[PDB]
Design an enzyme around this catalytic site. Sequence first.
Site, PDB file in Angstrom:
ATOM      1  N   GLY A   1     -53.367   9.253  41.065  1.00 19.79           N
ATOM      2  CA  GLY A   1     -53.282   9.540  39.618  1.00 19.79           C
ATOM      3  C   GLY A   1     -54.370  10.478  39.152  1.00 19.79           C
ATOM      4  N   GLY A   2     -55.296   9.949  38.358  1.00 20.27           N
ATOM      5  CA  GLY A   2     -56.307  10.794  37.653  1.00 20.27           C
ATOM      6  C   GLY A   2     -57.137  11.718  38.517  1.00 20.27           C
TER       7      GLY A   2
ATOM      8  N   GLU B   1     -44.330   4.062  34.924  1.00 22.07           N
ATOM      9  CA  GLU B   1     -44.257   4.590  33.554  1.00 22.07           C
ATOM     10  C   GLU B   1     -42.851   4.873  33.133  1.00 22.07           C
ATOM     11  OE1 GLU B   1     -47.220   7.708  34.126  1.00 22.07           O
ATOM     12  OE2 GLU B   1     -48.762   6.127  34.296  1.00 22.07           O
TER      13      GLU B   1
ATOM     14  N   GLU C   1     -47.152   0.644  43.846  1.00 21.76           N
ATOM     15  CA  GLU C   1     -48.020   0.653  42.636  1.00 21.76           C
ATOM     16  C   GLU C   1     -48.397  -0.784  42.288  1.00 21.76           C
ATOM     17  OE1 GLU C   1     -45.034   3.026  40.093  1.00 21.76           O
ATOM     18  OE2 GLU C   1     -46.985   3.422  39.281  1.00 21.76           O
TER      19      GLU C   1
ATOM     20  N   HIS D   1     -41.262   5.664  39.022  1.00 24.71           N
ATOM     21  CA  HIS D   1     -42.633   5.443  38.651  1.00 24.71           C
ATOM     22  C   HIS D   1     -42.681   4.362  37.583  1.00 24.71           C
ATOM     23  CE1 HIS D   1     -46.686   5.943  37.128  1.00 24.71           C
ATOM     24  NE2 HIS D   1     -46.982   6.514  38.296  1.00 24.71           N
TER      25      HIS D   1
ATOM     26  N   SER E   1     -55.224   2.825  42.012  1.00 23.96           N
ATOM     27  CA  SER E   1     -56.350   3.686  41.712  1.00 23.96           C
ATOM     28  C   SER E   1     -57.054   4.092  42.992  1.00 23.96           C
ATOM     29  CB  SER E   1     -57.303   2.945  40.755  1.00 23.96           C
ATOM     30  OG  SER E   1     -58.378   3.774  40.369  1.00 23.96           O
TER      31      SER E   1
ATOM     32  N   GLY F   1     -55.027  -1.779  33.770  1.00 25.62           N
ATOM     33  CA  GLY F   1     -55.430  -2.192  32.440  1.00 25.62           C
ATOM     34  C   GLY F   1     -55.552  -3.692  32.285  1.00 25.62           C
TER      35      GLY F   1
ATOM     36  N   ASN G   1     -50.080  12.940  41.640  1.00 29.15           N
ATOM     37  CA  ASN G   1     -49.249  12.820  40.421  1.00 29.15           C
ATOM     38  C   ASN G   1     -50.069  13.220  39.218  1.00 29.15           C
ATOM     39  OD1 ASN G   1     -47.475  12.185  38.443  1.00 29.15           O
ATOM     40  ND2 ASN G   1     -47.552   9.941  38.717  1.00 29.15           N
ATOM     41  N   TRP G   2     -49.857  14.445  38.745  1.00 26.42           N
ATOM     42  CA  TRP G   2     -50.574  14.931  37.616  1.00 26.42           C
ATOM     43  C   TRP G   2     -50.177  14.231  36.313  1.00 26.42           C
ATOM     44  CZ3 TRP G   2     -50.560  21.008  37.914  1.00 26.42           C
ATOM     45  CH2 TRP G   2     -51.015  21.380  39.179  1.00 26.42           C
ATOM     46  N   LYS G   3     -49.006  13.566  36.263  1.00 27.56           N
ATOM     47  CA  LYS G   3     -48.477  12.990  35.035  1.00 27.56           C
ATOM     48  C   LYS G   3     -48.311  14.110  33.993  1.00 27.56           C
ATOM     49  CE  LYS G   3     -50.283   8.507  36.381  1.00 27.56           C
ATOM     50  NZ  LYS G   3     -50.776   7.166  35.910  1.00 27.56           N
TER      51      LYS G   3
END
Lengths: 256, 256
Positions: free
Chosen positions: A238-239, A101, A171, A99, A217, A177, A9-11
């Site tokens: 993700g990242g 987000e 997720e 998702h 993550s 965070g 997932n590049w977002k």
Amino acid sequence: SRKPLIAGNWKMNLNHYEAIALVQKIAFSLPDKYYDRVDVAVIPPFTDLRSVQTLVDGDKLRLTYGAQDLSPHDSGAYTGDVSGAFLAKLGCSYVVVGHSERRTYHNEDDALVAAKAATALKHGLTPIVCIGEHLDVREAGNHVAHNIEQLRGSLAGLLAEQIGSVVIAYEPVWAIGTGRVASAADAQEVCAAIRKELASLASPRIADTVRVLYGGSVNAKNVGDIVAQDDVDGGLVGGASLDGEHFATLAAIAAG
Amino acid sequence: SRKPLIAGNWKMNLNHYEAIALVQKIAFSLPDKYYDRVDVAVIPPFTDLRSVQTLVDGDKLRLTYGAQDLSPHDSGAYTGDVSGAFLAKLGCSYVVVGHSERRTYHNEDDALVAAKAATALKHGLTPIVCIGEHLDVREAGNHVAHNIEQLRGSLAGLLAEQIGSVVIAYEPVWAIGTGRVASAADAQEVCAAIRKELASLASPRIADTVRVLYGGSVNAKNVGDIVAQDDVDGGLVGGASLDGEHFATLAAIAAG
């Protein structure tokens, strides 16, 4: 066995030529032999899909691709929205729905997620249906039940064979965070409960075919412990998906 | 004088093959003499933009293009969302912000629209800032004031000079699916009040340069009357935009 899936997932990252460069980094980094043992997908922004499609189809790459959302509607007066028909015509294999987000920033509830999942399937796309609980639920010790309830709501209306055509992604939103870390055991507990519920919503046979991914993550040092879990079939990454070498390494680990 | 602008909002219609066919039909259908007299833009779904860019650039077309929304952010963890950075790299000239469909279906408020407008300008895009009142407000006779307040709120945070770099579109939402019909005089009433307010928010000189479009039902039968009005500078066209010959005809009428 279920074939594992590593989906990146590049977002909201990377323009169309950056997209091409990333896909080439991945393609040139991942030995061919691995594709027989792992499915590898990139999930770029909508505006990058043409560029990725023509690279992937034109060079006959074995990586697949998908999108990050779609409309619950097929066409019409929905300015700004993207149809699953467009994604299908572009050769997308997957579409992320629900998702966290989008649930959070764009007011998507379970019913909308279910509608999007059904529309995805209408267009021959495999929805990656995302669920996951917040820290308050986790702290109350009610995470398994909450996830089951969210899964039921986010798959509402789908028939058993339609359930067989989805992917689920867990997720651990409670570990985003907050400084908390989700262990492989935490992932396995939820993914096992997911599969048990899928067996009720469809059948044991069908539930045993459904890929359930970890969507927390993921990096090279934790991916192997996570994908080794009995009920975990890969990752919605993700990242790390934005670094071609890193992402290829995840795929190689998940393959073996 | 202000040069008229005919912009075709495709909404959620047309895959990437259909996009190519439509743009080629438009280019075939509109005599070149017309572009010195009218600006013409197509506004496709996100997934068609690369295709449209390569055709426009490769055929050296005089039509321009834009997108139907964008994120208020430049990049990041906003799964599903599309950056104005991506749109700029695709060669978009315009981006629609605050379309009624997004205000209604996606809960976008004036403050979000203003943030989107600012972000569009940061990426060198011309935002088409949409406003318009619903039936209840029209039935009360408070429509002009309601539109001016919406305009103020949807341009909040922009400096006077930045207001010179936007386009406004008035959508008579009260005449969209209600059985009510907006006349050219109704368009002129609101568009003149929009310009009066832009004169206050910016300056009279800047207000006289800002293109204010009509974004109700525009077709070959009514476009001439609409564009004839003193304070109306073109159209943000719906369904007629999907037929290349019809769309070309609108532009030709708007040009003289």
